[PDB]
Structure formats: structure tokens, C-alpha cells
Design a protein around this ligand. Structure first.
Ligand SMILES: CCCCCCCCCCCCCC(=O)SCCNC(=O)CCNC(=O)[C@@H](O)C(C)(C)COP(=O)(O)OP(=O)(O)OC[C@H]1O[C@@H](n2cnc3c(N)ncnc32)[C@H](O)[C@@H]1OP(=O)(O)O
Ligand SMILES: COc1cc([C@H]2SCC(=O)N2Cc2ccccc2)c(Br)cc1O
Length: 382
């Protein structure tokens, strides 16, 4: 209906059709110097994630209070080392790791983050931030703390001369530039049925289901191997060229490519295809993000892989993703998740992905442009 907070923000209204390209409002020439006021008993604290104790406090906040499915059965369980990967890419700033603490106990009860990103949106490239990890402790919910967090990070980003942002959320807000759907590929169908993520259908037995989802023990694509340091430039080249075909994409430097793709166990996997000539022609990537399974006596966690960026020039995408599934299965993953963005719709149903509940909406702050189909979205966030 109406949005008490979002109606005040430089975003387009829901329902309106946009036929133009540009900022909702001009760059601000002076910026509020003072932090926005929090409710009594709470205080701002920029979190030094290089401090092990502090990073663990953030881990705990998110582990207990971050995104849950609509049925409150699963919650994201970002690891401390994943958080460090996600939150300290090239150009990261300490003031952009924005925490809220209880004054008396010092308990961490809120967080929001910004990281810098160059973003290509239709015919324009803009320096932006990506906003992520917005979280308010369950005990502080529905107390309008989130608008304060959003305004405060906005202010801190403005101070650095940045006036646009990109973000995703499961909720519908003014106004999505793209709407995506999560799809899931069962790797361990037994466990997934046991924990009620998926259901054993009427026309299939467990024996049939396990047979349906059974995968080869090793990948089939010739010359597929983990990305190494020597592959950083070619991965950068391949990615840059591949992304041109989409309408919302990152523009990554070679240093950013090293950060986002160089393999780190239990965080990010990247495999390249090195052909018979020694040329790298393709790559696949996926990140590691487990979920907590709540209120279960025996199964406490679900290990999930998330499709990241997959670039093909000589190996068909279908083959690359088949190998991604096999590699994920080998590494002990229970499920493989992918969005319906980029060219993913060409392989999702073929490789036995099932559609998930809920949407992932893509948003831009202070940028008005026509909305795009999922197939034109070429940006994947953590
Ligand atoms: C130039 C720089 C710009 C930088 C900033 C760019 C914008 C970035 C924007 C943020 C990008 C975040 C990206 C991610 O991290 S998406 C992940 C979000 N996190 C979670 O879902 C974790 C679990 N949930 C919580 O912690 C929450 O309940 C939160 C913190 C989400 C809301 O806390 P609470 O439940 O206690 O509610 P409130 O009473 O305080 O406040 C209610 C208001 O908040 C609006 N709301 C609710 N959910 C979201 C949401 N996910 N994005 C934007 N707005 C949201 C809601 O419509 C209402 O406004 P309005 O309806 O009255 O208008
Ligand atoms: C349960 O329905 C889904 C929930 C999620 C998110 S919400 C909290 C969480 O932990 N998830 C990761 C997960 C949990 C379980 C299976 C696969 C992925 C996603 Br993304 C897509 C779904 O369809």
C-alpha cells in the first residue's frame, strides 16, 4: 500500500513505468556530519572485523538473527571467514561496517554494511556501493531500527562521494529493477527430505528420487581444474567480455577478480577449463553458504553451494553446470542453488533444478531506469 520509510527515499514508486535513465536526485553538495540518533540505550560502533572477537560477535548476530525462510525452518549461517571475504574486498572502508550495540552490556544487536562496487547499468557505469547484511536482533524487531541503519549507512556512503547503491532482498520494496527466482538442485535428496526442505512426491519413491538426482563421481569436461594465480588475468578477461551481454553487471578490476574468484576452501570455488593448447576458455564458480536447520534433534546444518559467475566460450554452459553439480557433490554439499538470471534458464530445468519459494528482487538506490527480465541481470551478490 504505502511505505512510511521508502516513500521518503530517492527510489521510483511501485507500479510506475520508467522510460528514462538517470539519478532520482542530484549528488548532494553537503552532507550531514552527525550520525543519526538511535533509540535510547543503543550506540553506533564501527566493527573492526580484523579483530577476532569482534568478527565472532558479528558471526553470532547473523547466525542467530539473519535471513530465515518464510516458514522459519532454515537460517543463513555465514562463516566468520566468509564474512571477511564478503566484507573486505578491495576498497573496503571501516566506517562501512556499521554496528549497533546495547550501551550497558555492549551486546551487538544491529548491523549493516556497504562495500564499493563499480556497476554497469544499461549504458552507464557508476561507482556504487553494495549494501548487505542488514540485521536487527529479534528482540529489537518492528521498532523502526532498520530505517535508522539505512539512513546511517547512506550518510556514511555520501561522505565518500558515492550517491548510488545496489542491493537485493526477498521483500518487495519501491522499486525492483529486476525480479529473480532461486532454483535448487538436490545433491543429497535423503537429507533434504528428512529436514523437510523438499518432499518425497506421490508418483516417486525414495529409491526413484535418489536415482533421479544421482550424479557422476568426477567431472567430464576436459582440462577442468581449480583456478590458480596464473589464471587471474584470463579469468578477468573472460568475465569482462561475457558480462557485456547483460544490463546490470559488475565492472571488476583484476584485483577484484582475484578477490572474488581465487579459491578459498569453504568460501569460494572456481574451476577453469584449460584446453589442449593450454588456453583457459571457460570457468565455473560457486560460493559456500551453509544454513542452520532450527529445532531439529539430529540435523543441525545444511551445506549449500551457490552459483556465482559461470563463463563459457568453448564449453557449452550445460556441460559446465553439470560439472559444477558434480564438484559440489564431491565437496559434500547437500544442495546447489542458482538464480534464474543471466543464461541460467537454459540449464535449470535440464539439470533437474526445482523452483524455490519466494523471489529475489534487485534494487538500485537513487537510479531510475526501466526494469529488466532476469535474463538481463548479470550481477550476483553474497
Ligand atoms: C548511496 C548509498 C545508499 C545506501 C543505502 C541503500 C539502500 C539499502 C536498503 C537496505 C538493503 C538491505 C539488503 C539486505 O541486507 S537484505 C537482508 C535483510 N535482512 C534480513 O532479512 C535479516 C532478518 N531480518 C531482520 O533483521 C529485519 O527484520 C530487518 C533488519 C530487515 C528489518 O527490521 P525490522 O523488521 O525490525 O523492521 P523495522 O521496523 O525496523 O523497519 C521497518 C522498515 O524496514 C523496511 N524493510 C524491511 N526489510 C527490509 C529490507 N530487507 N530492506 C530494506 N528495507 C526493509 C520495511 O519495509 C519498513 O519500511 P517501510 O515499509 O515502512 O517503508
Ligand atoms: C527453504 O526455502 C528457501 C530458503 C532460502 C534461504 S532462506 C534461509 C536459508 O537458510 N536459505 C538457504 C537455503 C535453505 C535450505 C535450502 C536451500 C537454501 C533460499 Br536462498 C531459497 C529457498 O527456496
Amino acid at each position: 500500500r504505502s511505505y512510511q520509510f521508502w516513500d521518503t527515499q530517492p527510489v521510483p514508486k511501485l507500479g510506475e513505468v520508467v522510460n528514462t535513465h538517470g539519478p532520482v536526485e542530484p549528488d548532494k553538495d553537503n552532507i550531514r556530519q552527525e550520525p543519526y540518533t538511535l533509540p535510547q540505550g543503543f550506540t553506533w560502533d564501527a566493527l573492526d572485523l580484523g579483530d577476532r572477537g569482534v568478527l565472532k560477535e558479528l558471526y553470532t548476530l547473523l547466525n542467530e538473527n539473519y535471513v530465515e525462510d518464510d516458514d522459519n525452518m532454515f537460517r543463513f549461517d555465514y562463516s566468520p571467514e566468509f564474512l571477511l571475504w564478503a566484507l573486505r574486498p578491495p576498497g573496503w572502508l571501516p566506517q562501512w561496517h556499521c554496528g549497533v550495540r546495547v550501551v550497558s552490556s555492549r551486546k551487538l544487536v544491529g548491523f549493516i554494511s556497504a562495500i564499493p562496487a563499480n556497476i554497469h547499468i544499461y549504458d552507464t557505469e557508476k561507482k556504487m556501493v553494495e549494501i548487505n547484511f542488514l540485521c536487527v536482533h529479534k528482540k529489537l524487531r518492528s521498532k523502526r531500527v532498520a530505517p535508522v541503519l539505512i539512513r546511517e549507512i547512506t550518510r556514511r556512503v555520501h561522505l565518500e562521494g558515492i550517491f548510488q547503491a545496489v542491493y537485493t532482498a526477498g521483500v518487495v520494496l519501491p522499486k525492483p529493477v529486476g525480479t529473480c527466482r532461486y532454483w535448487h538442485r538436490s545433491l543429497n535428496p535423503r537429507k533434504l527430505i528428512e529436514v523437510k526442505f523438499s518432499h518425497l512426491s506421490r508418483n516417486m519413491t525414495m529409491q526413484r528420487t535418489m536415482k533421479l538426482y544421482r550424479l557422476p563421481e568426477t567431472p567430464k569436461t576436459a582440462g577442468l581444474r581449480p583456478m590458480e594465480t596464473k589464471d587471474i588475468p584470463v579469468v578477468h578477461q573472460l568475465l569482462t567480455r561475457y558480462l557485456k551481454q547483460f544490463h546490470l553487471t559488475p565492472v571488476m578490476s583484476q584485483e577484484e577478480v582475484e578477490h572474488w574468484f581465487y579459491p578459498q576452501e569453504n568460501i569460494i570455488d572456481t574451476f577453469v577449463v584449460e584446453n589442449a593448447n593450454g588456453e583457459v576458455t571457460d570457468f565455473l564458480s560457486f560460493y559456500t553458504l551453509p544454513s542452520t536447520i532450527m529445532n531439529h534433534p539430529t540435523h543441525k546444518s545444511l551445506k549449500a553451494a551457490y552459483s556465482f559467475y559461470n563463463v563459457h566460450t568453448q564449453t557449452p554452459l550445460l556441460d559446465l553446470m553439470s560439472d559444477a553439480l558434480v564438484l559440489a557433490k564431491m565437496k559434500g554439499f547437500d544442495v546447489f542453488n542458482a538464480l534464474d538470471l543471466m543464461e541460467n534458464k537454459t540449464f535449470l530445468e535440464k539439470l533437474k533444478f526445482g523452483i524455490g519459494d519466494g523471489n529475489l528482487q534487485y534494487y538500485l538506490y537513487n537510479w531510475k531506469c526501466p526494469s529488466m527480465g532476469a535474463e538481463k541481470v548479470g550481477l550476483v551478490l553474497q
